[PDB]
Amino acid sequence: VPMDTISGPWGNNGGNFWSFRPVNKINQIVISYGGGGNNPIALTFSSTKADGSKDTITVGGGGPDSITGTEMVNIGTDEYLTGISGTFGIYLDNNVLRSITFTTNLKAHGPYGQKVGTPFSSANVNEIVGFLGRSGYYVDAIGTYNRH
Amino acid sequence: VPMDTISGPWGNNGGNFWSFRPVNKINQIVISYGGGGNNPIALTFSSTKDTITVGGGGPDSITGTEMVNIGTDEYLTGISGTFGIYLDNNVLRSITFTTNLKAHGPYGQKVGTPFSSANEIVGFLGRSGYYVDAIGTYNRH
Ligand SMILES: CO[C@H]1O[C@H](CO[C@H]2O[C@H](CO)[C@@H](O)[C@H](O)[C@@H]2O[C@@H]2O[C@H](CO)[C@@H](O)[C@H](O)[C@H]2NC(C)=O)[C@@H](O[C@@H]2O[C@H](CO)[C@@H](O)[C@H](O)[C@H]2NC(C)=O)[C@H](O[C@H]2O[C@H](CO)[C@@H](O)[C@H](O)[C@@H]2O[C@@H]2O[C@H](CO)[C@@H](O)[C@H](O)[C@H]2NC(C)=O)[C@@H]1O
């Protein structure tokens, strides 16, 4: 049984594995921030079905950390995710996701968070049809599922 | 400059180092529990005022406490207990505080790997975060 090509994951081995590849396009992403600054702590990916129901996952933000702010990625009708990039660095003695950018066929959304630490970038070829990685209190790792 | 004899510590490398050796006798120990059960999450050592609390660094709410009251002619002499897994953490599961008079405990659930010290206990040290990762004693004969 064939399975979608994984790019990455990028990051480290903390937290718990997570995966989300819905059968319908991911049209909305919420970046949750903590600590009063631009510190990403959680990601929500959602895909709205024709009937009004949503496929959704939230990863990271597994702790008591108060959500202090959110940013959103809105993916339009003739828009689709093509690439991701960002940085992994230290947030409160944790090597985690520090910034993230979501590229579509139409624009780059972001940067979301703080451009600090070790950078990573997906291969510029392609459609991103899902995400996977590791998370706990924050986002420990992230990669993509891909289909050309 | 001499320093008091350390026994142990026992446990693992989790959490942060802690240490408490007061010049006044430790007369009370509070054992804090979490998750509605017999699961120790924090230890408070207090002197006749010197005090420390170790563990309980999480949002985990305290669901109960128990107390050792050390008598005026009583003093700590040994410790023992177990370490094991509590919510994906290899931490302290039970502890017994022995004095010249009696063993106090056990406090918690006697599950996991046992330990026991080989005297007066004059303080404690260890590692802690959300729970108690390690524990040992300062000693003076
Ligand atoms: C529920 O408590 C656990 O998770 C705490 C947060 O760490 C999680 O999130 C990060 C980032 O996403 C991730 O990398 C971790 O793996 C962990 O996720 C958990 O992963 C395990 C599998 O590994 C999985 O089973 C769990 O489901 C998953 N949790 C969730 C909610 O999904 C963690 O506290 C963090 O621990 C790391 C070191 O592992 C540390 O760097 C972080 O600074 C610290 N976070 C915070 C907010 O303090 C919990 O562990 C605590 O307490 C334990 C018990 O006493 C200790 O053994 C741990 O070491 C840690 O204490 C911290 O220790 C570091 C030094 O090691 C010290 O700098 C901190 O001060 C101290 N914390 C305190 C309060 O003193 C526990 O794993």
SS (H, E, C) A91-110: CCCCEEEEEEEEEECCCEEE
* Parallel/antiparallel/unpaired status of strands A69-74 and A95-104: unpaired
What is the C-alpha radius of gyration for chain B, rounded to an integer number of angstroms? 14
Our answer on whether the CB atom of A42 is closer than 6 Å to any ligand 1 atom is no
* Residue A63 one-letter amino acid: G
Cis peptide leading into A111, omega within 30 of 0? yes
Q: How many C-alpha atoms does B115 have within 13 Å on its Cβ side?
A: 23
Rounded-to-integer distance, Cα B6 and Cα B9, Å: 8
Residue B38 structure tokens: 């017999």
How many Å separate Cα A116 from the centre of its chain? 17
Contact between B34 and B46 (Cβ < 8 Å): no
Rounded-to-integer distance, Cα A116 and Cα A129, Å: 27
Q: How far is A65 from chain B (nearest CA, A)?
A: 9
Contact between A109 and A63 (Cβ < 8 Å): no
Experimental method: X-ray
Residues A108, A67, A118: CA angle, nearest 5 degrees:
50
Which DSSP symbol is given to A148? -
Q: How far is CA B85 from CA A109, A126, B66, B136, in A?
A: 42, 44, 21, 19
Task: Output the CA B15–ligand 1 centroid distance in Å.
Answer: 8
* Parallel/antiparallel/unpaired status of strands A108-113 and A95-104: antiparallel
Our answer on whether the CB atom of A90 is closer than 6 Å to any ligand 1 atom is no
CATH architecture of B1-141: Aligned Prism (2.100)
Q: How far is CA A33 from CA A145, B59, B88, in A?
A: 24, 19, 26
Which DSSP symbol is given to B9? E
* Residues of chain A neighbouring B58 (CB-CB closer than 8 A): 64
Residue B18 structure tokens: 């802690």
* Residues of chain B neighbouring A64 (CB-CB closer than 8 A): 58-59
- Cβ-based interface (< 8 Å): residues of A facing B: 63-64
Q: How far is CA B15 from CA B11, B12, B28, B93, in A?
A: 11, 9, 24, 15
Rounded-to-integer distance, Cα B40 and Cα B132, Å: 8
* Residue A59 one-letter amino acid: V
Contact between A55 and A5 (Cβ < 8 Å): no
Rounded-to-integer distance, Cα B10 and Cα B7, Å: 9
Classify residue B67 by burial, with Cβ atoms within 10 Å: 0-12, 13-18, 19+.
exposed
- Cβ-based interface (< 8 Å): residues of B facing A: 58-59
Q: What Å resolution does this PDB entry report? A: 1.9
Q: Domain ranges in chain A?
A: 1-148
Residue A110 structure tokens: 């972001």
Contact between A56 and A18 (Cβ < 8 Å): no
Residues A41, A29, A84: CA angle, nearest 5 degrees:
80
Beta bridge partners of B38: none
What sign does the CA torsion over A76, A79, A81, A85 have?
negative
Rounded-to-integer distance, Cα B68 and Cα A144, Å: 54
Our answer on whether the CB atom of A58 is closer than 6 Å to any ligand 1 atom is no
- Pocket mutation for ligand 1, best pick of B61, B130, B135 (most atoms within 8 Å of C-beta): B130
What CATH class does A1-148 carry? mainly beta
